[PDB]
């Protein structure tokens, strides 16, 4: 998208979201990142929304195909097609990870931007881990863990316990523990401690911030209800 203005790419990403054209949205936001400037809060959210929709569709398709393939193992077409979708999913994760490494993370000096990008890095390694098989899985899992852990360390030092990015990071890291790392007790402990520390800080918030934080706290509670 090298010939399109940065501001036009951002405007088109917003239009693509309204039109539910998420592949287009991701391509516009990739072009905007590649202009080389840092992203604002709103622009970071557009980048994340675009890719979460693209990879979310791929993950849902991969799960459907994997389920059919496993039942078939109780011609080569189901495996071949699951592999095709898997390769496409891995390519999207690699693209996002490449944008974070060149050069979003290294230029992110404020806590809000750096935590946001490291949470993304953990998420896309987690999506790689969902489809990885073997010892490849081990290094991919450690990459997710390391990204989430660095984000957590910054978030606990630099953000209040009600900050929505801090809360969403803790939510997703708890899902990592439960679903990827086979550490359900660590998942439950993280979700509980996060919820309780946020509850105790709600009194400091405006009505609008209260709504933002409690929405994500309910997600932590929903997981705790499922896990206990």
């Amino acid at each position: 998208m090298g010939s399109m203005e940065r501001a036009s790419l951002i405007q088109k990403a917003k239009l693509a979201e309204q039109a539910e054209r998420y592949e287009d949205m991701a391509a516009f936001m990739k072009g905007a990142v590649e202009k080389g400037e840092e992203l604002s809060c709103e622009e970071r959210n557009l980048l994340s929304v675009a890719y979460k929709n693209v990879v979310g569709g791929q993950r849902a398709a991969w799960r459907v195909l994997s389920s059919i393939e496993q039942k078939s193992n109780e011609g080569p077409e189901v495996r071949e097609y699951r592999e095709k979708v898997e390769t496409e999913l891995q390519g999207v994760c690699d693209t996002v990870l490449g944008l974070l490494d060149s050069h979003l993370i290294k230029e992110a000096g404020d806590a809000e931007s750096r935590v946001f990008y490291l949470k993304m890095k953990g998420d896309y390694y987690r999506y790689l881990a969902e489809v990885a098989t073997g010892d490849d899985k081990k290094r991919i899992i450690d990459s997710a863990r390391s990204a989430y852990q660095e984000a957590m360390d910054i978030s606990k030092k630099e953000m209040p316990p009600t900050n929505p990015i801090r809360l969403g990071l803790a939510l997703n890291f708890s899902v990592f523990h439960y679903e990827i790392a086979n550490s359900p007790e660590e998942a439950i402990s993280l979700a509980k401690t996060t919820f309780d520390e946020a509850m105790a800080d709600l009194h400091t918030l405006s009505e609008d911030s209260y709504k933002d934080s409690t929405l994500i706290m309910q997600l932590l509670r929903d997981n705790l209800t499922l896990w206990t």
């Binding site: 917003k14 994340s48 929304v49 929709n53 439960y178 997600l219 929903d222």
Partner: peptide
């Protein structure tokens, strides 16, 4: 188990 939906700006 649910992560942040993250699919709407």
């Amino acid at each position: 188990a649910g992560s942040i939906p993250g699919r709407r700006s």
